[PDB]
């Protein structure tokens, strides 16, 4: 008959864009049967008020799906946690648009949540892939540790064990700490020169300052940092010749909104020709039963995808997050961020521009030292010693 699709956007303009997009999707295949109306609500401060608001004002219209987005003003004060919990109580699937935090990538906690942007571990996938092209083998993996660092380290370690190789002394540090000089100094004396960093903004700035004061950012070295470690504080405390990463679209809400609406409409129409259809619950209070068809919907929303649209081709993988993204390798040259390459999928592609390494050495510095200062251990015994 009539089917609604709720959504939690950021500001009024994006709400109007969402309404126009659903109107356009209805202007596509609409041969009676379905009508596909759309509801909306703006982000709110606090969290309990937000959970109550989503509950009443959205589950009071038997919405078949929910669209979320990153809060406009803050950065993590209004993460889409309440929506996921409240709408996963009933197993009503929700779609993330521009949130990437690798806590929603496991279905033990968030029972119905799938994004359209690769969270943060696929950065480690690109780390491993690009490691082969320049052919250096020994790395030290300097990573933070609350949840993000553990996930990134686990992903890289799992990937790196295919070729039977192993990483050097992976070393952690507590979030929001000071005086990391001792740990960094310990990492300085070793036989590896390429170091991989995965930590938040301020921690990255602290690590950069500590490394600079230990003159470890000199020639013969090479760094590797994810998207967060630059572009937040990357013109005030970053060394020269550092190789970052960047998702091409990212904060382009309109394109993601259009693509998500397309995918949801296509999958809803594909599902509706099934024998066992049951409508979502009508009210938040007085109903405590799982929407029976709910999980099945998830499956027909997961495997199908394929709505070839503006952002490219969309194909959700086994556990949510979209695969086959397109990153864009960057580099610093005199406080600039010129582009050096493009990674499309399973293969990097360099460009026509040369690359400056940490110190201006126009070369391809390999990482190895071979100390030749071995320490030896012996035991007092017999005529031998």
């Amino acid at each position, epitope marked *: 008959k009539i089917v609604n699709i709720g959504a939690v956007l950021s500001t009024r303009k994006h709400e109007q864009m969402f309404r126009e997009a659903v109107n356009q999707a209805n*202007k*596509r*295949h*609409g*041969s009676w049967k379905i009508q596909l109306n759309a509801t909306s609500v703006t982000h709110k401060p606090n969290a309990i008020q937000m959970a109550l608001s989503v509950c009443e004002d959205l589950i009071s219209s038997q919405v078949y799906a929910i669209l979320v987005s990153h809060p406009p003003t803050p950065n993590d004060h209004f993460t889409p946690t309440p929506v996921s919990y409240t709408a996963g109580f009933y197993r009503i699937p929700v779609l993330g648009l521009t949130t990437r935090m690798s806590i929603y990538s496991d279905k033990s906690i968030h029972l119905s949540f799938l994004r359209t942007v690769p969270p943060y571990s696929h950065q480690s996938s690109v780390w491993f892939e690009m490691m082969r092209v320049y052919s250096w083998n020994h790395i030290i993996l300097l990573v933070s540790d609350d949840h993000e660092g553990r996930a990134a380290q686990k992903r890289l370690e799992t990937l790196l064990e295919e070729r039977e190789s192993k990483a050097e002394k992976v070393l952690q540090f507590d979030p929001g700490t000071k005086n990391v000089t001792a740990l960094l100094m310990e990492a300085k004396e070793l036989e590896a020169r390429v170091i991989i960093l995965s930590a938040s903004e301020d921690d990255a700035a602290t690590v950069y300052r500590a490394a600079a004061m230990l003159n470890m950012t000199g020639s013969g070295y090479v760094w590797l940092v994810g998207e967060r470690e630059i572009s937040g504080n990357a013109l005030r405390y970053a060394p020269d010749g550092i190789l970052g990463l960047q998702l091409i679209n990212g904060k382009n809400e309109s394109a993601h909104i259009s693509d998500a609406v397309g995918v949801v409409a*296509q999958a809803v*129409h*594909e599902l509706l020709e099934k024998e066992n259809i049951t409508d979502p619950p009508r009210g938040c209070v007085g109903n405590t039963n799982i929407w029976k068809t709910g999980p099945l919907f998830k499956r027909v929303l997961m495997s*199908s995808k*394929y*709505a*070839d649209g503006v952002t490219g*081709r969309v194909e959700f993988n086994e556990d949510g997050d979209r695969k086959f993204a397109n990153y864009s390798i960057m580099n610093l040259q005199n406080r600039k961020l010129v582009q050096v390459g493009i990674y499309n999928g399973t293969h990097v592609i360099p460009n026509d521009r040369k690359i400056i390494w940490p110190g201006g050495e126009t070369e391809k510095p390999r990482g190895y030292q071979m100390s030749t200062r071995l320490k030896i251990v012996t035991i007092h015994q017999e005529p031998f010693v």
Partner: antibody
Amino acid sequence: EVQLVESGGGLVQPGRSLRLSCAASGFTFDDYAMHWVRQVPGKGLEWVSGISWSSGSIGYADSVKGRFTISRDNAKNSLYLQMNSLRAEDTALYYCAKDRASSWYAYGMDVWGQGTLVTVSS
Amino acid sequence: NFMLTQPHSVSESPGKTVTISCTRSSGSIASNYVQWYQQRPGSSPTTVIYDDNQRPSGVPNRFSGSIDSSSNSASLIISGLKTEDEADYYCQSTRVFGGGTKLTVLG
């Protein structure tokens, strides 16, 4: 680039069966779905069937229930149209059409084939 | 359902801009989409216009689509040029095809 070729059409007596094969070249085979539409002499065209990106989403024309079936193999980038119990009012052409999305709900096709000939009569 | 209606044929002389419309029987025109298809005799039909007024790659402009509701119909306007581009045209909305109008260059 994107080329479309079809074969398997011809003349046969009433009460027989037929199987038309449409092979593509160039563009990826799995990512798109292709319809089946026919040109009639003098008059225009009329939709027949429609496949999904892989399977599942299916659809047939109103007057062609039971008579026709549609299937595809993604290995050798081919499309098979099998049908039986032929009649006399279908003695026309059959065009191979490729859509633009992965589902046939859009009903928008582009880059046709070249047409095939069928005619059933005594 | 419905049944789109279009004029049987049209005759034109080189250097004149002409409009061709196909009329929708029932339902609002703006509810659904329309596409204009072309074919050469002995040649497979090829799309010229899709999504109301949108030009696929290779179209040499000229082909303009009007989606004014008017009496529930849509039209395409072509500028003054004859060349060899004089053949039957079709418009398609949803599982419905028209008879086809023949564009003839007046000799």
